């Protein structure tokens, strides 16, 4: 019982309330494509290739999000936002996810869990993850916070 | 040998050069989603649901385009543009497709083939198609035109 509390709650529904022996993935990168990248890439596209382009992205993205499960991670604390496509997948995988985690929390979590805050998903591997005996969400007053306990 | 010539060529590659006993689908509707509908629907969306929305569209669209094969049509002459996603599918189905067909040509084709120019895909059925002994593309001088012959 040594830890970090985070005033954030799991981003999704059917995500676990508790995770015993958590393999924590600290992602500094955003698990979502900015409205500006898409709008810009859509405007500059030939009218006929808009849907083709959009499919390539959603597939690349789904392939990229999947690199989280492949690392064996069962908990992912993202510094940025996590979009709905990424929320659903992580939910089905039973992965506990939190978004908009403060930079300070990310740094603390890093040192307390021995995880390496990755800025890109192709760098997410079993070795850059953090360890913690238990990661869980609970009601603390009128707030739902995330508790990272037993920081190994 | 009675017909309509169209100064347009098949929109795709691996589409047939000839179609014997053509079952012609006259589509007044566009087989593509306007850049403006998407850009607008993307801007007004919550940043996180952009990709979800985009997937729903591509699937609805692919389901809608498929209503062409289901009618038994082997030739589709669209009054508007046909996007790349729609070009590929039609190509795999061996369906001869042409886009940006002039309104006058559409009306002529209608009366000469007995087809009903549909403005919506859910109205495409075996009965609203036209008949023609042969629909084919060929080089006429420095142009590649479409010839609808044996108009039944």
Swiss-Prot record, chains A, B:
Post-translational modification: The N-terminus is blocked.
Domain of life: Archaea
Stated role: Molecular chaperone; binds unfolded polypeptides in vitro, and has a weak ATPase activity.
Quaternary assembly: Forms a Heterooligomeric complex of two stacked eight-membered rings.
Family, similarity comment: Belongs to the TCP-1 chaperonin family.
Protein name in UniProt: Thermosome subunit alpha
Organism whose genome encodes this protein: Thermoplasma acidophilum (strain ATCC 25905 / DSM 1728 / JCM 9062 / NBRC 15155 / AMRC-C165)
Top-level taxonomy: Archaea, Methanobacteriati, Thermoplasmatota, Thermoplasmata, Thermoplasmatales
Range of the intact protein held here: 214 to 364 of 545
């Amino acid at each position: 019982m040594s830890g970090i509390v985070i005033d954030k709650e799991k981003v999704h529904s059917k995500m676990p309330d508790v995770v015993k022996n958590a393999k924590i993935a600290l992602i500094d990168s955003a698990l979502e494509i900015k409205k500006t990248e898409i709008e810009a890439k859509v405007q500059i596209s030939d009218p006929s290739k808009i849907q083709d382009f959009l499919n390539q992205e959603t597939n690349t993205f789904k392939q990229m999000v999947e690199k989280i499960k492949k690392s064996g991670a069962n908990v992912v604390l993202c510094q940025k936002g996590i979009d709905d496509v990424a929320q659903h997948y992580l939910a089905k995988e039973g992965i506990y996810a939190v978004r908009r985690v403060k930079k300070s929390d990310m740094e603390k979590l890093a040192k307390a869990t021995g995880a390496k805050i990755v800025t890109d998903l192709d760098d997410l591997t079993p070795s850059v993850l953090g360890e913690a005996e238990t990661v869980e969400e609970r009601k603390i007053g009128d707030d739902r916070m995330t508790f990272v306990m037993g920081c190994k």
